[PDB]
Amino acid sequence: ASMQKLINSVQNYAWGSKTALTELYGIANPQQQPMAELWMGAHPKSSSRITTNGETVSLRDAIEKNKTAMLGEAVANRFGELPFLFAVLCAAQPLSIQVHPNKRNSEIGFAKENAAGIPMDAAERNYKDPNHKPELVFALTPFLAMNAFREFSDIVSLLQPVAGAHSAIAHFLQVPNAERLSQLFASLLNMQGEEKSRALAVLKAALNSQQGEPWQTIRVISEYYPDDSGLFSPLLLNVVKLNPGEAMFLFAETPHAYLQGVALEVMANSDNVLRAGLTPKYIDIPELVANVKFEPKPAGELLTAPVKSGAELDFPIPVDDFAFSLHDLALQETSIGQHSAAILFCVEGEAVLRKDEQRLVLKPGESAFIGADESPVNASGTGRLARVYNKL
């Protein structure tokens, strides 16, 4: 068939919501597993499937047998595989603070760690592959996140109340610049024993006298990470509440965390994660610091500003690994075409896809794969369809 309704995998990671995918889309969960991510792609750990003829086949296998026709020549020649994973993320508790190195450093780090025979599944294995990990989140319900350093004057204001927590806070307040921000970031994550306990005590008392954000976000995080030095991170990093339909790009070398709510996430293919708190795992502070850009991002530059052309709302992404757009649906068909493979996902309403004689209906939460050779398709109905594709 031209258009292929996807059979997608749900990752039941312990941190997933037991209800979000059911409340949103009617996805079954009678056994009440945590449902953390709904995956749409060709990931080797659990590829989406397509129906051939009766049988189902792995999308990954289907693509591997026919890369040019399925991916298009540009993506096949640049990446050699579907270059993204698209997911619904349903964060029922706050997740870890993460940084993804840039492509060059990822290549350098992947090598370093190979040339010292570090086991893959080991604690200190920072670079699992040589790829960068650009990511976009697009809010499906109100979506609370941290992303990027605050303006230095903002950090200064927020740290005043906890100046006695740690000498590195005083040091930064004395001269609030990128060097001392770096030292502060690293000192906080390296806090131990009485040093850490004193700092956490001062912060917890501040939660009694300081109201509103980001103190409220610290309170929310403390439910799940009561003894984590990452509880100070909302004072250094922007706290953003995305409304449904808003999006943000997670740049390289930039700390971020997904704290609450449901989002679509599009990500390049990498498992390179340098954690930066809100985690029980060992953190390599020097390697983290060497891969963080200590440059404020002001609040008004955090969201991706999309561009509306006809029925298409494009969210410009500054990497080649993926592109992302939203499409309004109406009675009159709209043509949705691309040079690459596409995944189309029904956000809300109901989508009728048509390619010549074939008609495929998607309800909210369902998705289809469109191979490059099958572009374009016509879409009608009501609501909105999200598309992940490549603009090369």
Looking at 94-102, 304-312, 330-338, 355-363, which segment touches Zn ion (CB under 5 A)?
94-102
Looking at 96-104, 187-195, 225-233, 278-286, which segment touches Zn ion (CB under 5 A)?
96-104
Which residue number, 20 or 257, has a Cβ lying nearer to Zn ion? 257
Q: Answer yes or no: is 332 a known binding residue.
A: no
Total residues at interface with Zn ion (CB under 5 A): 3
CB of 217 to Zn ion, least distance (A): 18
Tokens 């659990």 belong to 46
Establish if 98 lies at the interface with Zn ion (CB under 5 A). yes
CA–CA distance, 107 with 48 (Å, rounded to integer): 28
Q: Answer yes or no: is 98 a known binding residue.
A: yes
CB of 131 to Zn ion, least distance (A): 13
What residues numbered 345-374 form the site for Zn ion, per CB under 5 A? none
CA–CA distance, 12 with 358 (Å, rounded to integer): 34
Active site (annotated) includes residue 275: yes
- Bridge partners for 315 per DSSP: 324
Which residue number, 98 or 367, has a Cβ lying nearer to Zn ion? 98
Choose, from 49, 150, 180, 275, the residue flagged as catalytic. Answer: 275
Q: Answer yes or no: is 100 a known binding residue.
A: yes
Q: Answer yes or no: is 348 a known binding residue.
A: no
CB of 11 to Zn ion, least distance (A): 16
CA 148 to chain centre: 14
Which residue number, 95 or 329, has a Cβ lying nearer to Zn ion? 95
Which residue number, 287 or 374, has a Cβ lying nearer to Zn ion? 287
CB of 182 to Zn ion, least distance (A): 20
Establish if 106 lies at the interface with Zn ion (CB under 5 A). no
Closest CA to 291 of 275, 305, 271: 275
CB of 265 to Zn ion, least distance (A): 8
Residues in the chain: 392
CB of 87 to Zn ion, least distance (A): 12
What residues numbered 172-191 form the site for Zn ion, per CB under 5 A? none
CB of 275 to Zn ion, least distance (A): 10
Which residue number, 230 or 371, has a Cβ lying nearer to Zn ion? 230
Which residue number, 133 or 384, has a Cβ lying nearer to Zn ion? 133
Lay out the site mask for Zn ion across 234-253 (x = CB under 5 A, - = otherwise): ----------------x---
Establish if 270 lies at the interface with Zn ion (CB under 5 A). no
Q: CA 249, 250, 254, 257 torsion: positive or negative? A: positive
Apex 105 CA angle, 100 and 106, nearest 5: 60
What residues numbered 110-139 form the site for Zn ion, per CB under 5 A? 135
Which residue number, 132 or 387, has a Cβ lying nearer to Zn ion? 132
Quick one: tokens of 43?
């990931």
**Which stretches of the chain bind Zn ion, using CB under 5 A?**
98, 135, 250
Binding residues for Zn(2+): 98, 100, 135, 256
Which of the residues are catalytic? 275
Binding residues: 98, 100, 135, 256
